[PDB]
């Protein structure tokens, strides 16, 4: 199981956001809860998908429209895992990163994103220079359709 433009592993863009869809898309040892929440004037659902104790995914969508993954064994196909330092893709933040952590693109990708966390330092309401970010590991990979 990798994050690539089509998906998470078999989860993609034409999965449904229903519990058995997801369960059957799954390929691990996982657990599956649900939620809701408030978007763009109405109520949506999304599901997290747990690794233990810890939420190893987070599954928006009524079709998938967004994953969050943050279970440290499935990487980016662009090899980028969680842990990955800042350092490794980036020389600078300019224009390739924003305040989310930071969020980032991933070099030559329409849907992957990356957040980054570390110490923060400077002002909280933008993103930390580059000589505190360079130390930042990735926490977290987003895919979007």
Same mark, same amino acid.
């Given at each position: 199981?990798?994050?690539?433009?089509?998906?998470?592993?078999?989860?993609?863009?034409?999965?449904?956001?229903?519990?058995?869809?997801?369960? *059957?898309? !799954? %390929?691990? +040892?996982?657990?599956?809860?649900? &939620?809701? $929440?408030?978007?763009?004037?109405?109520?949506?659902?999304?599901?997290?998908?747990?690794?233990?104790?810890?939420?190893?995914?987070?599954?928006?969508?009524?079709?998938?429209?967004?994953? *969050?993954? !943050? %279970?440290? +064994?499935?990487?980016?196909?662009? &090899?980028? $895992?969680?842990?990955?330092?800042?350092?490794?893709?980036?020389?600078?933040?300019?224009?390739?990163?924003?305040?989310?952590?930071?969020?980032?693109?991933?070099?030559?990708?329409?849907?992957?994103?990356?957040?980054?966390?570390?110490?923060?330092?400077?002002?909280?309401?933008?993103?930390?220079?580059?000589?505190?970010?360079?130390?930042?590991?990735?926490?977290?990979?987003?895919?979007?359709?």
């Amino acid at each position: 199981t990798k994050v690539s433009e089509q998906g998470v592993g078999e989860l993609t863009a034409s999965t449904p956001l229903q519990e058995q869809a997801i369960a *059957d898309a !799954l %390929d691990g +040892d996982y657990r599956l809860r649900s &939620g809701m $929440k408030t978007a763009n004037g109405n109520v949506v659902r999304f599901f997290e998908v747990m690794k233990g104790d810890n939420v190893a995914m987070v599954i928006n969508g009524g079709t998938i429209s967004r994953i *969050d993954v !943050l %279970d440290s +064994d499935i990487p980016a196909d662009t &090899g980028v $895992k969680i842990g990955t330092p800042f350092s490794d893709l980036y020389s600078k933040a300019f224009g390739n990163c924003q305040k989310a952590a930071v969020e980032c693109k991933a070099e030559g990708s329409q849907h992957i994103s990356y957040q980054f966390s570390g110490e923060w330092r400077g002002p909280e309401g933008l993103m930390p220079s580059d000589d505190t970010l360079k130390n930042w590991k990735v926490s977290k990979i987003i895919w979007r359709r």
